[PDB]
């Protein structure tokens, strides 16, 4: 049950802003598949990022939603693959939101080497405006 | 096994097999669809039942008639199965590949709870 612990540790580390732990738990050359909403001028929607590309997108999103946190609701493991359902909770200008996130991660030697994630952005927008 | 149920579900969606879909999904299943599947009558974040889900899926089938969903990775622990799928098709001569992530609870060989989200923005970018 080591891969499960890695992924639980990842979301803890994102919530705390713990860069050191993030960089231990994610390989520098990990293949990170972010959703099309994270697409931009240099990286069109289908294009994988590396670790620091992912942490860059995370930091941008944190600037807009400084109190956003992720809590793991379900976790399943088979071999080196871990899938998770999380709920991202925050407020925008004092109005609370709850958004589902689904993730799939490959873990090797206690580090993330591949990750897919998608968030329910439309449901979150509906709750705010 | 729960893995077999979920593999059978995506086969049945690909073939348009309503009878098998209704065998594999309980009528009272709790289906958490993304906000994109929200509607005037069903606001975003409201769960649907089976027939609500099959209603949304039938619209999506009619809109992308050559789209298929293929299970790429599947993980199982107890009654929970998560899957990563790729939805592939050519729509009006433009090819597309979009990731889908799903999580299902299976009980007595039927889906009783399901969460799904698709990478719609990536798909739209590939078509326009």
Residue numbers in the entry:
A (entry chain B): 6 to 134
B (entry chain A): 7 to 134
Which statements did the authors publish about this structure?
IdmH is a homodimer, with the individual protomers consisting of an α+β barrel.
Here, the crystal structure of a selenomethionine-labelled truncated form of IdmH (IdmH-Δ99–107) was solved using single-wavelength anomalous dispersion (SAD) phasing. The asymmetric unit comprises one copy of the IdmH-Δ99–107 dimer with the entire polypeptide chain successfully modelled into density, except for the N- and C-terminal regions. Both the selenomethionine-labelled protein structure and the isomorphous native structure of IdmH-Δ99–107 were modelled independently, giving almost identical structures that superpose with an r.m.s.d. of 0.12 Å over 257 amino acids.
